[PDB]
């Protein structure tokens, strides 16, 4: 029989031990240790120089936690007690108790410099200011996860009688605006793999029936999530809700398989923390405990790469066997052009709506454009070698720099395709007319 749970992102179960992590992210991590019927909570940072690490005794059993650059929020799901602790001492630590119905429990909490949110098993949404003053109350499908950035908030909802779904909204000073509300989520539930209920796995899924390791906004403010498919998913076109679509941008199983030399090693797992441009920030976990353990390892990094390869063909092309596979130029150029295109489009959306957030992204986009045309030229040259005039000409239309088109003319001449040379220069004339206009 199914059962609802309280949850916090990137924390861990106890296993059999007396300690666990409550939440973890690129700014820091929260850990706790059991001291008889009392608990010690510690807030740690990946910049302890800026932010004092601090610890205190939890006499309440806080089972919910949220960490940001200003403070840490704690919650007790049964009693409804909550507590906020700023990292500084300019702002006070403060506590509050939230009303709860019989059998109702707080399922998730979130806090930003401009908004605070609480959710419950009976689908009630409550919002507050940074002092705990209430703003509003709303009724939804049951809420199972929350995350936020400035006024932007992303929520996940689930019921057997309404399905699995999400909401995207911005709690602006004008009003709460819904981009999407309780729209179906295209993510594989862990219980689809019903037969994998081994003892070590069963503890984790009793701790986290949803299976999701984390959910967060990108460095560019885009929603992202990592599920039981061991794949990182990113929501594209979220700023344009008519056009929104989820993209699988990185599979950890494929990467670890390749990194092992194309081998099925059952021994290493990835714990995600945050996505920064093209690179996932994550912790590498090993062995039966698929959740990270104590002492916490040092963080690692991994690049996003598109799911566009076949294992058997990769092994046959590769044919020191543990060294990562040698990928053909065709496959490499293919994935490069797709990844360049995806990254350029997402960054374009970022800059067109929110501007330069770091002050250099124009350079990144220019570099991506160079990589894109160069990838296409590799694929074009391969097509010319195959003498497929139509496919070669189709690829020519996708280039962006006239310099690449000129290179394509030279390639066509080497390929001895005068018809293709003629048609490419017709395209260059057409683009020159477009450049004149």
């Amino acid at each position: 029989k199914f059962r609802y749970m309280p949850f916090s992102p990137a924390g861990t179960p106890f296993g059999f031990t007396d300690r666990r992590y409550l939440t973890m992210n690129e700014v820091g991590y929260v850990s706790t240790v059991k001291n008889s019927e009392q608990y010690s909570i510690t807030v740690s940072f990946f910049d302890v120089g800026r932010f004092r690490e601090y610890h205190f005794e939890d006499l309440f059993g806080y089972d919910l936690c949220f960490l940001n650059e200003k403070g840490t929020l704690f919650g007790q799901s049964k009693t409804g007690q909550i507590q906020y602790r700023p990292h500084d001492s300019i702002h006070s630590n403060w506590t509050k108790i939230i009303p709860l119905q019989a059998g109702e429990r707080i399922t998730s909490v979130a806090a930003t410099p401009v908004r605070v949110i609480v959710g419950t098993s009976l689908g009630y949404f409550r919002s507050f200011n940074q002092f705990g003053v209430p703003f509003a109350v709303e009724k939804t499908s049951p809420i199972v996860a929350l995350t936020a950035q400035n006024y932007r908030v992303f929520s996940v909802h689930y019921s057997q009688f309404h399905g699995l779904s999400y909401s995207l909204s911005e709690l602006g000073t004008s009003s709460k605006r819904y981009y999407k509300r309780e729209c179906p989520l295209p993510m594989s539930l862990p219980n689809i793999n019903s037969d994998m209920k081994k003892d070590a796995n069963l503890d984790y899924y009793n701790f986290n029936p949803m299976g999701i390791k984390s959910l967060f906004f990108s460095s560019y403010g885009d929603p992202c999530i990592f599920g039981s498919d061991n794949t990182l998913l990113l929501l594209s076109k979220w700023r344009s809700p008519e056009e929104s679509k989820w993209l699988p941008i990185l599979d950890s199983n494929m990467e670890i398989w390749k990194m092992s030399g194309g081998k099925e090693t059952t021994d290493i797992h990835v714990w995600p923390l945050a996505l920064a441009y093209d690179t996932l920030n994550c912790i590498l976990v090993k062995g039966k405990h698929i959740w990270p353990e104590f002492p916490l390892p040092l963080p690692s990094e991994m690049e996003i790469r598109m799911p566009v390869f076949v294992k058997s063909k990769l092994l046959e092309e590769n044919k020191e066997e543990d060294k990562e596979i040698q990928i053909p130029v065709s496959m490499a150029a293919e994935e490069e052009y797709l990844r360049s295109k995806v990254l350029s489009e997402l960054l374009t959306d970022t800059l067109e709506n929110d501007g330069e957030m770091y002050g250099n992204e124009n350079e990144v986009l220019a570099a991506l454009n160079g990589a894109y045309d160069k990838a296409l030229l590799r694929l074009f040259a391969s097509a010319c070698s195959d003498q497929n005039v139509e496919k070669a000409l189709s690829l020519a239309h996708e280039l962006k720099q006239d310099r690449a088109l000129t290179a394509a003319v030279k390639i066509s001449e080497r390929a001895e395709l005068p018809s293709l040379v003629k048609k490419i220069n017709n395209i260059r004339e057409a683009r020159y007319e477009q450049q004149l206009k």
Binding site: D373, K374, L377, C384, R403, A407, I411, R414
Partner: peptide, 10 residues
């Protein structure tokens, strides 16, 4: 054909 690519890099 690699020299036209090395062209395309430069």
């Amino acid at each position: 054909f690699d020299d036209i690519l090395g062209e395309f890099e430069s």
